[PDB]
Symmetry: D2
Subunit: 295 residues, 4 copies
């Protein structure tokens, strides 16, 4: 037997941080869930009971809190890069750090039209994420994502002209509901290290905002031929708007809303042109995935 | 043995309905989860295998869809009252109908400042609920609620002067974080029947909006002495603003955010006046409940 | 405005306790989730910012751990009664304590036929619960329950002879699948206080075991006319086997498994006598409730 | 822009199947959740609104049910291989099929010592899974797994001799609780196709049983130096017992149970040798991963 791969660390580290602007009195809050997994010359902790090579996960946790105290937690791409870099630089025998951050929404409350200085609402379960892979000698690989953005349109979605064989029962449609939970990931050009990441800091929030805006506008405006066609349009637009992105991945469930034939009851018409009441289906669900690159 | 209480029905009925304004082309969507449980002269289905008295739960489900097709689904207080009334009127032997409705948010999308005619976002997991108890000869009892409204304030919360004995370790504080998930219920005056409910229809959306506005404003603005003191202020204001409400119930978790002493690491100061990084606690949680009435 | 009802306390207190038999070396583990809510002369904490009457929920939490250290945590009926009694006796102004306990399964591992002295498995998500209401001057009300016992039978379930009207589409059946998640509660005779509870300690584990055995045997053996008929038989048997139980409540979802007509594909026969492949339905679900007493 | 990767299909397809032994009258039930995602010459569905190349996910769903009707659903490695092979053989332009199966437990009920012919219990939330990747011209890659096996031992776990620096607060221990949720995956030698899979059918159930037995025995019996050391022993034993496995992956959370110092209350001793009452921690959690191969 031989250890082919190993990684270990602390998952589900909840972190809150506040910034107090002293001039205005305005407070701003950040809340995240952090995972750090390490790789390196750790095989003997598995094979020979050698704990000497183990940076305890408890210590990893402490390190997350200390790093958040000493550094900005925004944008998450930066925080993750600082955190990951710390582990590979501090510990001679650690050669990679894998940092996952889930950012939770705390949106400033509006009270009688005024933004409140220190009151916030969890306005959506939509997340902003980063995956930061810091690898000794190969730089910093960042994947940024938004997830849990749930949307629905009541018309201007179609699905016809698909393959029909002896397995096919689905009727072609020129007018359906489309509902989905958007998971979109954009992968940055490899960064050489922390300096290069810092040099692009403004681009992170700007590109997240662009990706979200493009997603919503394209979903709302595309008279959709299919999930496939619509998601491709989103990706192509994001790529066109940020040079430093290599790939965009979308993963979209097709959350079906079924017509209910009520014609058995007093000839009630609730199908086709007359469809008003639908049965949202919990399961099963279509799952449509695309990775778009440049050429 | 004797059956002391019995109720039965269909739970977790997902319902979507669309309205198409033909003039403007504007579509509006409603999505809910419905539960209907019936009571009446049904004991023999339990005691003597007598299925003859059972309105099948499958039929209850059909009835929910048919009622949604034939009637407005908004406000939910009205829909629930219509639905409940149907069962007690249609079936001689059914004497009560218990209708629970969970309303899911589908907020119209804004695209370049314009509200989109047929595109929506699940903008929050916050729900609007009704419990409608239709009881033959005793009228219609409606409890309206909002739930899953998660809020946080970073200062202007205190907790001091509480009882201290040999079980007490908690330090008094004059500045803490307060975070909660608001569950608020307002119980209407008994309605004699469907006519009286209909006569008050506008009051339902208006009172829900008031309850939500009061909750958010009071939470944001109250320099809180405790959860108890703050929630009481919310309730008293709602009662003052709608004559037809008898009681308001609040149920508020105290979602603790703990200071992290980092003084063990290079004398880092992260407590009291210097507290920036906190550990949100998953469990356990305070749970504070209040029912406020008139006198 | 006037406070009509108030209660407050600590929820989601996770507790583990170990017993070490010194003779055998055998260890036994208990794990629970505890909620304690208090009532009493606490109105002024809500109405006048008077924290002086508040036993802090943090102190309630400490008290739960101290009580578990000083007393047996089994049977949960006893532990809950001790815990609740403490609050009403210690604090002059607290007049009721509501104690909910969820017991998690940690079943001893069998290794080559031998029970292992200190290794356990979470063998089921089935829970054993208690609700203990300790009310100053009115004694101790205990409701014991099992929940999350998920069962399925593949035949010997029927449902025919139900009411058929213009809302009915369900076909009568003489052979279906029946699947359910059993929630059963037995309510004890009021106890005068802690002495009387202690006097009946053996009855608690014995009655839980009886209730579970009766549930499983009756479910498995009853050629079921309906959920209603089967659940009544369970309840009547439990009542017959323990004098000190006043009522038994069952709450049973009907988790539907639908036939799939495949006759459209090469005349495949998968309905009625030929039904092999079924679609388990996530939602909606029947919900059947019964409370059985004595007469 | 150019599509670099694409896959699409149906997720969360719930499937139940019954076998009726006519001789004995014994029924046996299988329940699973199935995901099938396809790859192939499908780019134009994304880039040119060309639905002609799309095998509708609705058709994929139908195909899952038809395949379950026509073929054994056990072992899941076989079912997945049949299902995946169907898509690449039926459709000229589909070149890979990715089949994920989650098997749910339905354990036969024991009634007075007799196994019941048609009554089952969900005895654990532990799953048995397969991932079957059928790739045109490269054969069939099967990963088998067990997951959600939650275990706890109350002693004979240690953690000392780990790295100590200025980030370290964790005290070395020679006696702790160890609790984990076991996720173990074994990757089979590549199979050339369906014939070779069929030739090894007995090995699938046998190897799953071995992996589970080894996991439980090693966990229970190892006086653990660390999660790392213990999980390695499990993997090495599984590899030694089945020639046709290439790699074994374990992913183990370290579910912390914290000592509670009660010495502040009347000098109660509840730490070290006297630790009886512990606080199970929801989060954060260690996460320890290992892939073991041969050499
Ligand atoms: C109705 N429907 C399918 O049956 N397949 C799809 O995924 O769900 C698909 O491939 N494209 C769709 O947009 N709509 C679908
Ligand atoms: C810190 N804390 C308590 O210990 N009790 C309380 O509920 O959580 C309470 O009764 N009131 C509070 O607002 N804050 C609390
Ligand atoms: C098929 N079915 C119903 O439609 N109603 C029931 O609850 O689900 C009911 O009242 N009794 C049943 O056992 N079966 C049912
Ligand atoms: C106490 N503890 C750590 O702090 N790191 C570990 O993962 O949780 C680790 O690396 N090994 C352990 O078994 N125990 C741990």
């Amino acid at each position: 037997s031989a250890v082919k791969a190993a990684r270990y660390g602390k998952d589900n580290v909840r972190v809150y941080k506040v910034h107090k602007d002293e001039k205005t009195g305005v407070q701003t809050v950040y809340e995240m869930t952090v995972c750090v997994l390490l790789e390196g010359e750790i095989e003997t902790s598995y094979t020979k009971a050698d704990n000497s090579v183990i940076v305890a996960t408890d210590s990893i946790k402490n390190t997350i809190y200390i790093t958040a105290k000493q550094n900005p937690v925004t944008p998450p791409e930066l925080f993750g890069s600082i955190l990951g870099t710390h582990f590979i630089e501090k510990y001679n025998h650690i050669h990679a750090a894998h940092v996952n951050i889930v950012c939770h929404r705390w949106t400033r409350m509006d009270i009688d039209g005024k933004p409140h200085p220190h009151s916030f609402i969890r306005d959506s379960e939509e997340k902003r994420n980063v995956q930061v892979d810091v690898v000794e000698g190969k730089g910093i690989d960042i994947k940024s994502s938004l997830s849990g953005l749930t949307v629905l349109k009541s018309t201007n979605s179609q699905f016809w002209g698909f393959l029909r064989d002896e397995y096919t029962t689905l009727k072609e449609t020129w007018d359906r509901i489309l509902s989905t939970d958007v998971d979109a990931t954009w992968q940055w050009k490899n960064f050489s290290g922390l300096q290069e990441v810092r040099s692009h800091v403004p681009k992170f929030d700007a590109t997240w905002a662009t990706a979200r805006e493009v997603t919503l506008k394209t979903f709302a405006e595309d008279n959709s031929a299919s999930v496939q066609a619509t998601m491709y349009k989103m990706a192509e637009q994001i790529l066109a708007r940020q040079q430093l992105i290599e790939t965009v991945e979308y993963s979209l469930p097709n959350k079906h809303y079924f017509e209910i034939d009520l014609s058995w009851h007093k000839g009630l018409q609730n199908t086709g042109k007359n469809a008003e009441v639908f049965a949202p289906q919990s399961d099963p669900n279509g799952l449509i995935k695309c990775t778009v690159g440049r050429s």
